């Protein structure tokens, strides 16, 4: 593997996703694949659909083999059913050889191929235990780690910078994508990339919630989620704190729910507070904080939408937070790394910060229930 050749291997943005070019079958068919750290299947369109240009035609691949079974995957607000097979895949921006992997080819779906997408499948990079129909279906990254002789690590940089593609470095860390220190937080549970959130701070003030409220369902790092998603009680506390700290006198209730845009003539970002998320260090007595500036949560659409949404379920660190950071998914060492992204800059200003260490003596030793 060549990590320098992986720089700028993603196209897209937080609106419609970050996607990787993949070549599938013999002769190769080129697909555009969403990079998804919140799922564990490699699944591609196998039939024509309204919101896609191309699909993988298994009949045109001489190396494709059918496993003889289907899989149905269901999400909140969507689903698909596909045939499960095996074929050879190359990733041209990083590798020089092909690898044998499992592939699901989608023949029916609901709410999956959304309006506006440039991708026609998904690359699930989470752990085997989320794979469907079961964890015996070898995941793409498990196949790649073995067959390509790479370390069990990948890293991601998203350069949309709250509006320039990105990089998926399969097998390691590219030094040219960050400056300063990488801070590591333990993976609490290897399914999603579940990490432990200790504290949220808005404009320098703590929310003063029990730290279990940040982890109750789970806190995860998910490149296939657009917004920062917060459990309802955390969301309401954040909204209250943003409205108190902001130099805008009035926000509508509809602004916070995404029903109304906030509009100005000639930049709103100086009128909003920084938002900080504190993560436990590998030493449990230390934490570090990842900080997003208003640029990452007051999103241009000049009119602006709120870049945070309430969750029925989990606390999700999605693409818009990830647009601030080089994120290292260190599966081998059971940890997630963060460094501030040099590309996370708008109008000459960094849109994110990282700092530490801070003491965890005032917080419980386990914030997951």
């Amino acid at each position: 593997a060549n990590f320098l050749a992986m720089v700028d291997n993603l196209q897209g943005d937080s609106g419609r996703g970050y996607y990787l070019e993949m070549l599938i079958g013999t002769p190769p068919q080129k697909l555009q694949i969403l990079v998804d750290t919140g799922s564990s299947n490699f699944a591609v369109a196998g039939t024509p659909h309204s919101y896609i240009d191309t699909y993988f035609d298994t009949e045109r691949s001489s190396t494709y083999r059918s496993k003889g079974f289907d899989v149905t995957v269901k999400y909140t607000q969507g689903s698909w059913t596909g045939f499960v097979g095996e074929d050879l895949v190359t990733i041209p921006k990083g590798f020089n050889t092909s690898f044998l992997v499992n592939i699901a080819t989608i023949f029916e779906s609901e709410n999956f191929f959304l309006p506006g997408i440039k991708w026609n499948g998904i690359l699930g990079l989470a752990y085997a235990t989320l794979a469907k129909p079961s964890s015996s279906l070898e995941t793409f990254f498990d196949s790649l780690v073995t067959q390509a002789n790479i370390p069990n690590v990948f890293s991601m940089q998203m350069c949309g910078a709250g509006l320039n593609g990105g990089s998926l470095v399969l097998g390691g860390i590219e030094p040219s994508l960050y400056k300063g220190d990488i801070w590591y937080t333990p993976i609490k549970e290897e399914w999603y990339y579940q990490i432990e959130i200790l504290k949220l701070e808005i404009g320098g003030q703590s929310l003063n919630l029990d730290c279990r409220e940040y982890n109750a369902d789970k806190a995860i790092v998910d490149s296939g989620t657009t917004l920062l998603r917060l459990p309802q009680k955390v969301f309401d506390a954040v909204v209250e704190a943003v409205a108190r700290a902001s130099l805008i006198p009035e926000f509508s209730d509809g602004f916070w729910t995404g029903s109304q845009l906030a509009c100005w003539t000639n930049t709103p970002w100086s009128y909003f507070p920084k938002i900080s998320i504190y993560l436990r260090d590998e030493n449990s007595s230390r934490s570090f904080r990842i900080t997003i500036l208003p640029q990452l949560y007051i999103q241009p659409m000049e009119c602006y939408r709120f870049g945070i949404s309430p969750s029925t379920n989990a606390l999700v660190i999605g693409a818009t937070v990830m647009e601030g950071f080089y994120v290292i998914f260190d599966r081998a060492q059971k940890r997630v790394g963060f460094a501030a992204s040099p590309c996370a800059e708008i109008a000459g200003a960094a849109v994110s910060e990282i700092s530490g260490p801070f003491s965890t003596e005032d917080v419980a030793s386990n914030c997951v229930p």
Partner: nanobody
Amino acid sequence: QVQLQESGGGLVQPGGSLRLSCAASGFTFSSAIMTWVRQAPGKGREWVSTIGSDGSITTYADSVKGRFTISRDNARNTLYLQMNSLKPEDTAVYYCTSAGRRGPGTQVTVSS
């Protein structure tokens, strides 16, 4: 729960041969991609060969092409590696892996 157990290694001279086996249980072997990897002390992990579930698609590292042959018997839940024309630099623990799990491996030593 998944079990992989390799056997068939040994100590051979240069130009010798071995037949490695891996017995599998606790999953549907007939639907599993299977891979052989090798690891020698002080060296990097080295992919050897992969075989698709029906046995028809096989791939090999350049370092072993034309010398080693991967195969499987789905009815017997067994993976094989036929190793010919063995060289000192093939010395390693050889292990089978599938879906992020691995067996403990079998030692291959090639020496005069």
